[PDB]
Structures are given as C-alpha cells and as structure tokens.
Amino acid sequence: GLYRKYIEYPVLQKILIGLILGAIVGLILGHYGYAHAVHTYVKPFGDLFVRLLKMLVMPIVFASLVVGAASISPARLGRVGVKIVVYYLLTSAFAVTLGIIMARLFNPGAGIHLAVGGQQFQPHQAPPLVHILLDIVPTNPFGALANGQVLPTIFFAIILGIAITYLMNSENEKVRKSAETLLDAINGLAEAMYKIVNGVMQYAPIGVFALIAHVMAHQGVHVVGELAKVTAAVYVGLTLQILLVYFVLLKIYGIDPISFIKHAKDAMLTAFVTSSSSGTLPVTMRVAKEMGISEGIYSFTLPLGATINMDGTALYQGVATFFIANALGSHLTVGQQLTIVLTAVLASIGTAGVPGAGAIMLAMVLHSVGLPLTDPNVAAAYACILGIDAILDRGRTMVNVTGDLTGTAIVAKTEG
Numbered sequence: 001g002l003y004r005k006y007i008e009y010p011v012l013q014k015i016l017i018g019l020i021l022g023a024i025v026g027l028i029l030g031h032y033g034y035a036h037a038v039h040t041y042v043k044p045f046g047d048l049f050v051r052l053l054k055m056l057v058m059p060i061v062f063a064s065l066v067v068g069a070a071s072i073s074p075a076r077l078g079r080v081g082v083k084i085v086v087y088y089l090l091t092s093a094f095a096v097t098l099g100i101i102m103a104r105l106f107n108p109g110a111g112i113h114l115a116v117g118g119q120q121f122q123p124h125q126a127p128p129l130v131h132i133l134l135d136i137v138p139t140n141p142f143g144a145l146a147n148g149q150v151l152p153t154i155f156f157a158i159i160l161g162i163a164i165t166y167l168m169n170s171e172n173e174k175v176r177k178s179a180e181t182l183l184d185a186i187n188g189l190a191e192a193m194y195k196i197v198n199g200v201m202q203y204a205p206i207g208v209f210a211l212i213a214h215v216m217a218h219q220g221v222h223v224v225g226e227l228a229k230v231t232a233a234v235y236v237g238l239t240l241q242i243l244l245v246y247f248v249l250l251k252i253y254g255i256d257p258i259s260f261i262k263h264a265k266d267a268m269l270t271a272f273v274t275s276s277s278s279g280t281l282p283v284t285m286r287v288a289k290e291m292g293i294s295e296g297i298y299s300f301t302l303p304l305g306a307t308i309n310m311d312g313t314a315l316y317q318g319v320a321t322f323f324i325a326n327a328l329g330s331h332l333t334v335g336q337q338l339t340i341v342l343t344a345v346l347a348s349i350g351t352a353g354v355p356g357a358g359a360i361m362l363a364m365v366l367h368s369v370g371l372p373l374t375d376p377n378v379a380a381a382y383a384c385i386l387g388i389d390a391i392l393d394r395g396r397t398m399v400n401v402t403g404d405l406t407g408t409a410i411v412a413k414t415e416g
C-alpha cells in the first residue's frame, strides 16, 4: 500500500524533511534533559546508515581503478596525475590563508576563561617522509584490501589495469581470451556496487534524522558563549571558500556553475550529515559519472582527493591556531603567519594514510608557531574547541568533498 508511495517521492526532498526535523527535535529533547533517551534508541538507527556506506568503499575503489586504468592510455594517465596534484596544493594553501583573515576580523577567544584540567598525551610523532612514500607499494596486495588501506590499493589496481591492456593486444588467442574474461568479471563487480548504492539512499532519510538529532541534543547547547564566535568565523569562511574559490575557477575554465551545482547537490548534502569523506565516496563517484566525466578520469582523482585533499580541514587549523594564542594573549607576527601556511600544506601530504591524521596535523601546526601542546595551559584551551568539534565537523566535511568534485571537472574539461 503506502510502501510504494514512499518510493516515487523524490529522494532529495525526503532528506531535507529528515534534516530539518532532526535539528528541531534534537534541540527540544536536549532542553528538557532527554539526551540519554536519544543516545540509547535514536542513535543506533543512525549508526546503521554509516556502516552501510563504509561497506561499499573497498570493493568499489578496487574495481573502478582496474576498469578505469584499462580504458585510458598510460601516457594520458601521467598528465592527469600531475595536473590534479598541482591543483590540490594550490587550493589547500589558499584555504589556510582565507582562514587566517577570518580569524583576525572576528578575533575569537579574547578573554575566554582558562582552567587547569585533563592533560593531553604527548603528540604522536609523524613518520618520516621516506616511510610515507615507501608505504604506497603494498607488500601483500590481499592484505591491503583486508586492512582497508586506500592508498596502497590504488597503486596495485592501476598497474594491474595497465598490464591487462597489453595482454589484450597479444597475438595469442588463449592469452587474449583469458584477459577479456578477467576484465569482464571485475567490470561486473563494479556495476553491482553502483546498484547497491541506489538502494542505500532510500534508507538515507531515516539515517540523517537520527545523526542530527543526537548531536544537537548533546552538543548544540554549548554553542552559546565565546564558542559562538568561533563557529561564525569557520562557517563564514567555509561559505567563502565554496563561492570565492571554486565558482571563480569554474567560470575561468568555462564550466557552468549552475549546471555543476545541480548534479553535485546529492554528494554535497550527504557529506554534511555523515561527516566522512571516505564514506561519501560511493555517492561522490556515482555523481561524477552522471555529469559525463570519462571513466579513466574520475576513477583516479576522486579516491586520491579523499585521502590528501583537505580544504575545509585546512581552514579549521588556521582559525583554531589564532584562538589558542588569543586565549594566552600571545601575538602572531606577520612572519609567523606565513609559517602556518607552509606547515599546513606540508602536513596535508606528510600524513597521507596515517590513522586519525586530524590530531597529528593540528599538533604539528601548533608546534611550528612555538606553542607546543605539551604545555598544560594550551591543553585547556585545546580541550575547549573539542567541545564544539562535532558541530564544526559537520560543515568541515562538506568543503572537502566539494573541492574533490570541482577539481575533477576542471581536469575533465582540459582533457577534451
């Protein structure tokens, strides 16, 4: 009966109904002290949605690169790789600079109270750059898939796809027949993954309702106070990054911003609620093929962009750095501000593939400017932003995914 009517209704409109209702209901229950009820019963339905998305990440990445790399010539793949790497560094570098400007205007944490509390552990030492680069080659190809290591998986899939093309050009019929059979089986696996993604988004309206309700009930109350200025500075900066950066580049290269934003609305919104770039990859890759991007292009740029490209995260580090200093009353020299920009860019690619790189990257920036986290006083200031980290996390992820899609279109247009 009514089961069908739920289906024909547009999916995107159903998400907006859940998102608005989740924020409204979350605030009401939090005010009347019913946070435990939301945590016990409402949250598990939200956790089901994120587990479904993370299940498809590994099979869809390996299968897409093998098919994608086979279609594209080896020479063209090199030109695509160098272009996208240059794009990531420039956009991330400018995002940090934009965050510095916003912090100065708002001037957050001028007179916030400081109290001694729990001390953070000694910051994790970043692995040497030579170890990061050498870890791209997987010692065991099957071990990388089982352990969910994205970066080693990309390396093995690209070379496997290239080797298949040479086999299909051989003069031996037996070798040619075997190569086509292997490629067809892998191609079928990729197509099956996309079919599952469509079914998952039908459950998305329920999933988005639970996640927003839980966070607002427990954490939305703490926005009031000096932390409100921090939230205003970050979100205004994030809004500028989407408009002042991405839209300008799209106009320069001839891509229509209005046409692009219509296709990318699905990918942008789902990243806001899940707050996981890796979990959004199945949706993001589905959006890329809809625009008409070539299979070889988006199969390689999007998985790499999720790991290394952090535009919204970079702006978060720049704004948070000023807040800590303002709490202590320290003053940042113009030369020291330039040090932040260089440190943030290097840390983005210097922590590729390490678990929980968010903590390490922020610690490295604080150490560079002369404010080690080991200082007990900065730890109290640090543990103040983490009070509203989850709320800022929701908007931080949206910019990260947007930067990935914008770069893919620019390279695709240049491809011809």
Ligand SMILES: N[C@H](C(=O)O)[C@H](OCc1ccccc1)C(=O)O
Residues within 6 Å of the ligand: 275, 276, 277, 278, 313, 355, 356, 357, 358, 393, 396, 397, 400
């Ligand atoms: N949450 C974002 C994401 O999932 O990409 C982003 O990244 C956080 C993160 C999470 C796990 C590992 C590394 C970095 C952030 O700063 O919030």
Ligand code: NA
Residues within 6 Å of the ligand: 087, 088, 089, 090, 091, 092, 309, 310, 311, 403
């Ligand atoms: Na970037």
Ligand code: NA
Residues within 6 Å of the ligand: 305, 306, 308, 309, 310, 311, 399, 400, 401, 402, 403, 404
């Ligand atoms: Na990104």
